[PDB]
Protein backbone atom coordinates (compact mmCIF):
# COMPACT_ATOMS: atom_id res chain seq x y z
CA UNK A 1 0.00 0.00 0.00
CA UNK A 2 0.82 3.71 -0.26
CA UNK A 3 2.14 3.91 3.32
CA UNK A 4 3.80 0.48 3.37
CA UNK A 5 2.97 -2.61 5.42
CA UNK A 6 5.05 -1.83 8.51
CA UNK A 7 8.65 -0.84 8.88
CA UNK A 8 10.93 -2.66 6.45
CA UNK A 9 14.55 -3.64 6.75
CA UNK A 10 16.60 -2.09 3.94
CA UNK A 11 20.11 -3.06 5.12
CA UNK A 12 21.18 -4.66 8.40
CA UNK A 13 20.36 -2.12 11.09
CA UNK A 14 18.47 0.26 8.77
CA UNK A 15 14.68 0.40 8.50
CA UNK A 16 12.15 2.67 6.81
CA UNK A 17 8.58 3.11 7.93
CA UNK A 18 5.63 5.44 8.34
CA UNK A 19 4.80 7.62 11.34
CA UNK A 20 2.67 4.88 12.94
CA UNK A 21 5.48 2.32 12.65
CA UNK A 22 7.77 4.83 14.36
CA UNK A 23 5.68 4.78 17.53
CA UNK A 24 4.76 1.07 17.35
CA UNK A 25 6.42 -0.36 20.47
CA UNK A 26 6.06 -3.88 19.07
CA UNK A 27 7.82 -3.08 15.81
CA UNK A 28 10.52 -1.07 17.59
CA UNK A 29 11.34 -3.90 19.98
CA UNK A 30 11.10 -6.66 17.35
CA UNK A 31 13.56 -4.74 15.14
CA UNK A 32 15.71 -3.51 18.09
CA UNK A 33 15.39 0.12 17.01
CA UNK A 34 17.33 2.50 19.28
CA UNK A 35 17.75 5.44 16.88
CA UNK A 36 15.02 7.24 14.92
CA UNK A 37 15.59 9.79 12.16
CA UNK A 38 12.28 11.66 11.86
CA UNK A 39 12.15 13.75 8.69
CA UNK A 40 8.79 15.51 8.40
CA UNK A 41 6.95 18.75 9.12
CA UNK A 42 6.62 18.68 12.92
CA UNK A 43 9.39 16.19 13.73
CA UNK A 44 10.19 15.98 17.45
CA UNK A 45 11.40 13.27 19.86
CA UNK A 46 8.44 11.19 20.98
CA UNK A 47 9.40 8.01 22.84
CA UNK A 48 11.73 7.67 25.80
CA UNK A 49 14.76 5.42 25.43
CA UNK A 50 15.27 6.30 21.76
CA UNK A 51 17.88 8.67 20.30
CA UNK A 52 16.37 11.02 17.70
CA UNK A 53 17.55 13.16 14.81
CA UNK A 54 14.68 15.42 13.75
CA UNK A 55 14.75 17.17 10.37
CA UNK A 56 11.98 19.66 9.58
CA UNK A 57 11.30 19.09 5.90
CA UNK A 58 8.31 19.22 3.55
CA UNK A 59 7.54 16.56 0.94
CA UNK A 60 7.71 19.16 -1.80
CA UNK A 61 10.09 19.47 -4.76
CA UNK A 62 10.95 22.91 -3.35
CA UNK A 63 12.24 21.35 -0.11
CA UNK A 64 16.00 21.01 0.03
CA UNK A 65 17.21 17.78 1.62
CA UNK A 66 20.83 17.87 0.41
CA UNK A 67 21.77 20.23 3.26
CA UNK A 68 20.84 17.34 5.60
CA UNK A 69 22.59 14.40 3.87
CA UNK A 70 25.81 14.59 5.88
CA UNK A 71 24.16 14.81 9.31
CA UNK A 72 21.77 12.00 8.36
CA UNK A 73 24.59 9.76 7.16
CA UNK A 74 26.63 10.35 10.32
CA UNK A 75 23.63 9.53 12.50
CA UNK A 76 22.78 6.33 10.60
CA UNK A 77 26.37 5.18 10.28
CA UNK A 78 27.36 5.67 13.91
CA UNK A 79 24.28 3.71 14.97
CA UNK A 80 25.00 0.85 12.57
CA UNK A 81 28.70 0.69 13.52
CA UNK A 82 27.76 -0.05 17.14
CA UNK A 83 25.46 -2.87 15.98
CA UNK A 84 22.25 -0.95 16.70
CA UNK A 85 19.27 -0.35 14.40
CA UNK A 86 18.06 2.96 12.97
CA UNK A 87 14.57 3.70 11.68
CA UNK A 88 14.19 6.54 9.17
CA UNK A 89 10.59 7.67 8.73
CA UNK A 90 8.36 10.45 7.45
CA UNK A 91 4.56 10.42 7.34
CA UNK A 92 4.27 7.68 4.69
CA UNK A 93 7.81 6.30 4.38
CA UNK A 94 7.80 6.92 0.61
CA UNK A 95 9.65 10.13 -0.22
CA UNK A 96 11.50 12.19 2.42
CA UNK A 97 12.80 9.25 4.46
CA UNK A 98 13.60 7.25 1.33
CA UNK A 99 15.70 10.11 -0.07
CA UNK A 100 17.91 10.21 3.03
CA UNK A 101 18.33 6.43 2.97
CA UNK A 102 19.26 6.53 -0.73
CA UNK A 103 21.99 9.07 0.03
CA UNK A 104 23.27 6.78 2.80
CA UNK A 105 23.34 3.74 0.51
CA UNK A 106 25.12 5.73 -2.19
CA UNK A 107 27.82 6.73 0.32
CA UNK A 108 28.45 3.21 1.74
CA UNK A 109 28.46 1.47 -1.69
CA UNK A 110 29.51 2.45 -5.22
CA UNK A 111 25.85 2.84 -6.26
CA UNK A 112 24.30 5.71 -8.11
CA UNK A 113 20.92 6.91 -6.95
CA UNK A 114 18.91 4.59 -9.19
CA UNK A 115 20.65 1.46 -7.94
CA UNK A 116 20.24 2.75 -4.37
CA UNK A 117 16.53 3.28 -5.01
CA UNK A 118 16.34 -0.28 -6.36
CA UNK A 119 17.86 -1.45 -3.08
CA UNK A 120 15.27 0.48 -1.07
CA UNK A 121 12.38 -0.82 -3.21
CA UNK A 122 13.49 -4.43 -2.73
CA UNK A 123 12.68 -3.97 0.95
CA UNK A 124 9.93 -1.33 0.74
CA UNK A 125 8.01 -1.50 -2.53
CA UNK A 126 6.24 1.85 -2.07
CA UNK A 127 9.50 3.85 -2.07
CA UNK A 128 9.35 6.80 -4.51
CA UNK A 129 11.15 10.13 -3.91
CA UNK A 130 9.36 13.17 -5.34
CA UNK A 131 10.79 14.73 -8.50
CA UNK A 132 12.63 17.49 -6.65
CA UNK A 133 14.34 14.87 -4.50
CA UNK A 134 15.20 12.76 -7.55
CA UNK A 135 16.86 15.83 -9.10
CA UNK A 136 18.82 16.42 -5.89
CA UNK A 137 19.97 12.78 -5.81
CA UNK A 138 21.14 13.05 -9.43
CA UNK A 139 23.23 16.15 -8.64
CA UNK A 140 24.58 14.40 -5.54
CA UNK A 141 25.61 11.42 -7.70
CA UNK A 142 27.39 13.56 -10.26
CA UNK A 143 29.29 16.07 -8.12
CA UNK A 144 29.37 15.10 -4.43
CA UNK A 145 28.94 11.40 -3.63
CA UNK A 146 32.64 10.81 -4.30
CA UNK A 147 33.49 13.45 -1.69
CA UNK A 148 31.10 11.80 0.79
CA UNK A 149 32.62 8.37 0.19
CA UNK A 150 36.11 9.75 0.84
CA UNK A 151 34.84 11.52 3.98
CA UNK A 152 33.36 8.23 5.21
CA UNK A 153 36.67 6.43 4.68
CA UNK A 154 38.70 9.13 6.43
CA UNK A 155 36.29 9.45 9.36
CA UNK A 156 35.46 5.78 10.01
CA UNK A 157 38.23 3.75 8.32
O1 LIG B 1 5.70 11.46 4.40
V1 LIG B 1 6.67 11.13 2.98
O2 LIG B 1 5.45 11.88 1.90
O3 LIG B 1 7.90 12.30 2.51
O4 LIG B 1 6.65 9.58 2.14
Residue numbers in the entry: -1 to 155
Paper quotes:
DUSP22 is a small phosphatase containing 184 residues, and the sequence contains a catalytic domain as well as an N-terminal myristoylation site. In this region, the catalytic activity is facilitated by C88 in the P-loop and D57 in the D-loop, and the hydrogen bonding network is formed by D57 in the D-loop, S93 in the P-loop, and N128 in the N-loop.
The binding of the pTyr-like ligand was representative of the first step in the catalytic reaction, and the binding of vanadate represented the second step. Unlike Q262 in PTP1B, N128 did not rotate to stabilize water during the two catalytic steps. The DPN–triloop interaction was maintained in the catalytic reaction, suggesting that the stable interaction among the three loops was necessary for catalysis. Structural alignment among N128A, N128D, and WT_VO4 revealed that N128 participated in forming the conformation of the D-loop.
